[PDB]
Amino acid sequence: DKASMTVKINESLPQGNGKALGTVTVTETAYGLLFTPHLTGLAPGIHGFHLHEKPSCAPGMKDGKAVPALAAGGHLDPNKTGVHLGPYNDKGHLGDLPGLVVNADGTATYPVLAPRLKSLSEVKQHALMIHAGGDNYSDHPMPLGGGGARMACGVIE
Amino acid sequence: NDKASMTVKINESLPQGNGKALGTVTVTETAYGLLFTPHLTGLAPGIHGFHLHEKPSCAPGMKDGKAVPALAAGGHLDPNKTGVHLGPYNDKGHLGDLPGLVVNADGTATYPVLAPRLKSLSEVKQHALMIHAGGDNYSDHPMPLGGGGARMACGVIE
Ligand SMILES: [Zn+2]
Ligand SMILES: [Zn+2]
Ligand SMILES: [Zn+2]
Ligand SMILES: [Zn+2]
Ligand SMILES: [Zn+2]
Ligand SMILES: [Zn+2]
Ligand SMILES: [Zn+2]
């Protein structure tokens, strides 16, 4: 019996949840949490892929405008580093995962290992977020890796 | 703040010998294993098999009267003699199994890939860094060696 679980992912719209885009499997390995995606409908390329603090994917208000998945808050960051440094650096947000790789047909199938995370309990009650932009694992030149807008989200557990 | 790091140059692998230079891959020690950061151009968009092979050569090899590209690098690095391809997150297979190399739509590869099973540069030196035509499902099923198929670019580490 592997320590494994799934998370439903939905489109993040200004008014709430859009279509189900599929799932992501989260599995404990000898090397940390393996995120095996099973998603469809995404823009080909590499997308910011992070655990955000709050167990919500609902939109929020910012400067009078509807902001998709804003209720998830920022990146999971129990060490209070206040810095986005990616999946391989202990000095930044614990919620920083490797970029989500999206195939030419808009599907995501390629597994990504986040070695800093060791058990399922560490992802429960957080939002699994997929951004429009990519992620260079830095706050420079763009904040939070350049992920920009939130466009897909799933509350884990 | 600092970790061991080294660079490997990558060349197209043709039947005749080395092809165009395609750029480099940086191999860096992290607290989580070796990180491979590509700086590559001229690759088919998509995900490619990406492995360390036994021998310090990217040279063509002869097989059945034909020059097979990078065949001189031998098989996948397998010090424990597992004889099986199970990918970068499973200790029961080839130690040389790395995550699939991700190639952008524009033919460049930039997305860094971590191989947690490798800890130090000493483990990768004097072996070949191989880039396959096909992808890698980290299994000998349905196809052998992850379905990597032919070798199309290669670099000798160190
Ligand atoms: Zn994010
Ligand atoms: Zn972050
Ligand atoms: Zn700059
Ligand atoms: Zn330094
Ligand atoms: Zn190979
Ligand atoms: Zn192998
Ligand atoms: Zn060796």
TrEMBL record, chain A:
GO MF term (any one): copper ion binding
Binding site for Zn(2+) 1: 1
EC number, as in UniProt: 1.15.1.1
S-adenosyl-L-methionine listed as a keyword: no
Major place of residence: periplasm
GO CC, alphabetical: periplasmic space
Annotated residues for binding of Zn(2+) 4: 126
Ranges for domain Superoxide dismutase copper/zinc binding: 22-156
Positions that bind Zn(2+) 3: 75, 84, 93, 96
Chain positions recorded as Zn(2+) 5 binding sites: 140
Disulfide-linked positions: 57-153
Cofactor requirements of the protein: Cu cation; Zn(2+)
Cofactor: how and how many bound: Binds 1 copper ion per subunit.
Protein's name according to its UniProt entry: Superoxide dismutase [Cu-Zn]
Residue range from the parent sequence: 33 to 189 of 189
